[PDB]
Amino acid sequence: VSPVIGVILMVAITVILAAVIGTFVLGLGDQVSETSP
Amino acid sequence: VSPVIGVILMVAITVILAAVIGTFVLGLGDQVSETSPQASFDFDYTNTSGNLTITHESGTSIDADSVSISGPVGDDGKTWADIDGSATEITAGSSITVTANGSSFDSGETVRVIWTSDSGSSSSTLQSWTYNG
Amino acid sequence: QASFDFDYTNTSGNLTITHESGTSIDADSVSISGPVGDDGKTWADIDGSATEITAGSSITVTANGSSFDSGETVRVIWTSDSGSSSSTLQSWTYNG
Amino acid sequence: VSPVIGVILMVAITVILAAVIGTFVLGLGDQVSETSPQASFDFDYTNTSGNLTITHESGTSIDADSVSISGPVGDDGKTWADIDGSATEITAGSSITVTANGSSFDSGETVRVIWTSDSGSSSSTLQSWTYNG
Amino acid sequence: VSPVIGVILMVAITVILAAVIGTFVLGLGDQVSETSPQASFDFDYTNTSGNLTITHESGTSIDADSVSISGPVGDDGKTWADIDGSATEITAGSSITVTANGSSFDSGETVRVIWTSDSGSSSSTLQSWTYNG
Amino acid sequence: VSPVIGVILMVAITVILAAVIGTFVLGLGDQVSETSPQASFDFDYTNTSGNLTITHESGTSIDADSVSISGPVGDDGKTWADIDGSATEITAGSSITVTANGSSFDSGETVRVIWTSDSGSSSSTLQSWTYNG
């Protein structure tokens, strides 16, 4: 029983941590634009 | 006689206790679900008028009622389907326009794009934008 | 022994309960108890013509009033043929 | 007697709970697919008539029903296979002509080339063009 | 009496089943090893005689018995240590010469440099050369 | 009577054995902590006098008592806060000067910057410099 629950909680942590990285890298990539004439 | 009765009562206790654990572990395992969409957005700010435009660049298609804008803007806390009249899905090329609260932004003010699940028990920040003067 | 999936939609207040995996259950042995409109009715009553509960079978109940409040629980309950035993198959709590 | 029965019931719970996780992780892993084509386009604008020509320069071959034009132009929201009568693939040297809505563009107006997947659950912006006076 | 015996038999089953898993996972973990060398090679072809020269440019040192040539050439399937008489290592400046099968190459014919591990259960293509007329 | 007593004694054994595992796994899980700072340093050597200058370029701020210099230099094994009189933090623009042991370096001699944790049970090499003639 306990191994399956451990797997569930590890997956739950992984999803949140991946979202946290995704927001940061997307915001970092949006910053570059607007060349000058 | 007594050993057999003891065995019977021990089995009777075991069945109930196993059911009690089973309910708990099944309920615990049902809790994990509902991942959030992955997409990219473009923030375009004009200082003369204070208008900020948010456009969908690439990624999955998102329900317009699951996305809301939070920040120091006039349209604060409203969904993407409210800010424009008739949106239903957010695909590439879709945009909305909000205005900075007052008439302009101040350095260090953030505007976020937020996703909320259908049950309302999960949320995520899709993207955020900070004004850096 | 079986597993169920609870799917709640906040806009309309509808909660869907689906059989995921496990044994087959008589639809007259299972009832729903909770602050919902279909309270105390069996699985065979909520839908017109059910006879067995196998994987992929679902029912839809509605939150009493028009929405749930945080901390309200809905249970799935099994009752034996003689009526002298009962058990809670699964329960769902709304946590805002 | 009771320890063996407890073991039996614990194994019975374990099997179901493992199946419940397996379904979820398999469904999560099936979601990622369908990358977008990489290609380059040439935008050619004539101010006298307001006509903008979009030509495929180099890159992969693209279905003409997967590409649509979005912008302040008369042919807004139509696919590449609709704007010309009989296109089927987009290879190098293929071009379409749209006209600015009204009779001319205004500075700061953008026209995009957009790819949509067969299921309709993904989109991307291939290229965009902004008129800068 | 019976509960203690049930516990004893359950422990006896647990020990064996744990050993069975342990053997499998240890054998699975032992399988991954033996990465391939990284190096660069120069292919020099002369059309008059049909001779192709392969020279080691830069990178790690490679055993001459681990590298073989495969392609439409006379020395097909032979190791680097066979094509020249007395090679033992492949370092920068080392070269071999093969000849196109027949007396010349045809457009679209490929010659590869291939590494094989000591056990013989892994291989990789170090570099390939295609004749494009 | 005896089955119930057997159950009681089995439960009594189970509780103790579970506590014994719990202590071990909790202690094992407490061990992982204390990551090291990430920063960049500039090494500037003058051959006439044998002086090597180490400057903080960019990165996080570091306690001056957590960083020491190891190498064939006069100030060997001393912390960054000892080499200069009154340092407390290492931020960008902070530098120290050490002198090569003897009066000059020899080719192949390395100087390291080393971080040590507060408990003293972890260390890392921040950056190293080798003199290549």
Side-chain angles (χ1 to χ4, degrees):
Chain A
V1 168
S2 64
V4 186
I5 301 170
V7 167
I8 292 167
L9 306 175
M10 295 298 102
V11 172
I13 296 170
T14 294
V15 169
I16 281 153
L17 198 63
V20 181
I21 297 170
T23 302
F24 173 78
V25 297
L26 285 187
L28 194 159
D30 198 42
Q31 288 178 358
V32 63
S33 295
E34 198 67 28
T35 44
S36 65
Chain B
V1 168
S2 64
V4 186
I5 301 170
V7 167
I8 292 167
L9 306 175
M10 295 298 102
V11 172
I13 296 170
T14 294
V15 169
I16 281 153
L17 197 63
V20 181
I21 297 170
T23 302
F24 174 78
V25 297
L26 285 187
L28 194 159
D30 198 42
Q31 288 178 358
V32 63
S33 295
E34 198 67 28
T35 44
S36 65
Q38 300 183 117
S40 182
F41 295 84
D42 185 74
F43 294 81
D44 196 291
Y45 177 60
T46 300
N47 183 78
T48 308
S49 42
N51 289 334
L52 177 66
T53 307
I54 312 163
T55 311
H56 190 267
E57 267 172 330
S58 80
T60 81
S61 304
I62 307 167
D63 201 0
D65 299 69
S66 296
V67 170
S68 68
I69 299 296
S70 74
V73 287
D75 289 300
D76 180 70
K78 295 208 280 153
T79 66
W80 188 294
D82 281 325
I83 301 189
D84 59 354
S86 50
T88 285
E89 294 293 328
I90 316 169
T91 70
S94 297
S95 51
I96 56 168
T97 300
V98 308
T99 305
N101 204 355
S103 182
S104 61
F105 275 125
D106 300 312
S107 294
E109 289 194 317
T110 318
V111 179
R112 290 179 176 89
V113 182
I114 298 170
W115 174 81
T116 304
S117 80
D118 274 3
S119 63
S121 62
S122 286
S123 294
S124 183
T125 298
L126 299 179
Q127 196 140 321
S128 63
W129 176 85
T130 305
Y131 182 59
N132 295 300
Chain C
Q1 300 183 117
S3 182
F4 295 84
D5 185 74
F6 294 81
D7 196 291
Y8 177 60
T9 300
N10 183 78
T11 308
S12 42
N14 289 334
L15 177 66
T16 307
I17 312 163
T18 311
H19 190 267
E20 267 172 330
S21 80
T23 81
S24 304
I25 307 167
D26 201 0
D28 299 69
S29 296
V30 170
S31 68
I32 299 296
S33 74
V36 287
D38 289 300
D39 180 70
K41 295 208 280 153
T42 66
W43 188 294
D45 281 325
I46 301 189
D47 59 354
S49 50
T51 285
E52 294 293 328
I53 316 170
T54 70
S57 297
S58 51
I59 56 168
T60 300
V61 308
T62 305
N64 204 355
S66 182
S67 61
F68 275 125
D69 300 312
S70 294
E72 289 194 317
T73 318
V74 179
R75 290 179 176 89
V76 182
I77 298 170
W78 174 81
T79 304
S80 80
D81 274 3
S82 63
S84 62
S85 286
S86 294
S87 183
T88 298
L89 299 179
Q90 196 140 321
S91 63
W92 176 85
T93 305
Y94 182 59
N95 295 300
Chain D
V1 168
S2 64
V4 186
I5 301 170
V7 167
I8 292 167
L9 306 175
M10 295 298 102
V11 172
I13 296 170
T14 294
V15 169
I16 281 153
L17 197 63
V20 181
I21 297 170
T23 302
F24 174 78
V25 297
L26 285 187
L28 195 159
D30 198 42
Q31 288 178 358
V32 63
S33 295
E34 198 67 28
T35 45
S36 65
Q38 300 183 117
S40 182
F41 295 84
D42 185 74
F43 294 81
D44 196 291
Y45 177 60
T46 300
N47 183 78
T48 308
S49 42
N51 289 334
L52 177 66
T53 307
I54 312 163
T55 311
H56 190 267
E57 267 172 330
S58 80
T60 81
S61 304
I62 307 167
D63 201 0
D65 299 69
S66 296
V67 170
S68 68
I69 299 296
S70 74
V73 287
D75 290 300
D76 180 70
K78 295 208 280 153
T79 66
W80 188 294
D82 281 325
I83 301 189
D84 59 354
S86 50
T88 285
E89 294 293 328
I90 316 170
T91 70
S94 297
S95 51
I96 56 168
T97 300
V98 308
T99 305
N101 204 355
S103 182
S104 61
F105 275 125
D106 300 312
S107 294
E109 289 194 317
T110 318
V111 179
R112 290 179 176 89
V113 182
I114 298 170
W115 174 81
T116 304
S117 80
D118 274 3
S119 63
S121 62
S122 286
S123 294
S124 183
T125 298
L126 299 179
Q127 196 140 321
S128 63
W129 176 85
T130 305
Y131 182 59
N132 295 300
Chain E
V1 168
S2 64
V4 186
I5 301 170
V7 167
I8 292 167
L9 306 175
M10 295 298 102
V11 172
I13 296 170
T14 294
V15 169
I16 281 153
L17 197 63
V20 181
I21 297 170
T23 302
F24 174 78
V25 297
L26 285 187
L28 194 159
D30 198 42
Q31 288 178 358
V32 63
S33 295
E34 198 67 28
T35 44
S36 65
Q38 300 183 117
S40 182
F41 295 84
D42 185 74
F43 294 81
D44 196 291
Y45 177 60
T46 300
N47 183 78
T48 308
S49 42
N51 289 334
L52 177 66
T53 307
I54 312 163
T55 311
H56 190 268
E57 267 172 330
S58 80
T60 81
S61 304
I62 307 167
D63 201 0
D65 299 69
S66 296
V67 170
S68 68
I69 299 296
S70 74
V73 287
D75 289 300
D76 180 70
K78 295 208 280 153
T79 66
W80 188 294
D82 281 325
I83 301 189
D84 59 354
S86 50
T88 285
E89 294 293 328
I90 316 170
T91 70
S94 297
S95 51
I96 56 168
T97 300
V98 308
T99 305
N101 204 355
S103 182
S104 61
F105 275 125
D106 300 312
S107 294
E109 289 194 317
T110 318
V111 179
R112 290 179 176 89
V113 182
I114 298 170
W115 174 81
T116 304
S117 80
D118 274 3
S119 63
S121 62
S122 286
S123 294
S124 183
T125 298
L126 299 179
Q127 196 140 321
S128 63
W129 176 85
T130 305
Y131 182 59
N132 295 300
Chain F
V1 168
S2 64
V4 186
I5 301 170
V7 167
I8 292 167
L9 306 175
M10 295 298 102
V11 172
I13 296 170
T14 294
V15 169
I16 281 153
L17 198 63
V20 181
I21 297 170
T23 302
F24 174 78
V25 297
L26 285 187
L28 194 159
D30 198 42
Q31 288 178 358
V32 63
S33 295
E34 198 67 28
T35 44
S36 65
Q38 300 183 117
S40 182
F41 295 84
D42 185 74
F43 294 81
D44 196 291
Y45 177 60
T46 300
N47 183 78
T48 308
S49 42
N51 289 334
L52 177 66
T53 307
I54 312 163
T55 311
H56 190 267
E57 267 172 330
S58 80
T60 81
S61 304
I62 307 167
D63 201 0
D65 299 69
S66 296
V67 170
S68 68
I69 299 296
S70 74
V73 287
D75 289 300
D76 180 70
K78 295 208 280 153
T79 66
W80 188 294
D82 281 325
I83 301 189
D84 59 354
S86 50
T88 285
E89 294 293 328
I90 316 170
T91 70
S94 297
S95 51
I96 56 168
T97 300
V98 308
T99 305
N101 204 355
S103 182
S104 61
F105 275 125
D106 300 312
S107 294
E109 289 194 317
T110 318
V111 179
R112 290 179 176 89
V113 182
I114 298 170
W115 174 81
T116 304
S117 80
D118 274 3
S119 63
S121 62
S122 286
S123 294
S124 183
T125 298
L126 299 179
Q127 196 140 321
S128 63
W129 176 85
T130 305
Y131 182 59
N132 295 300

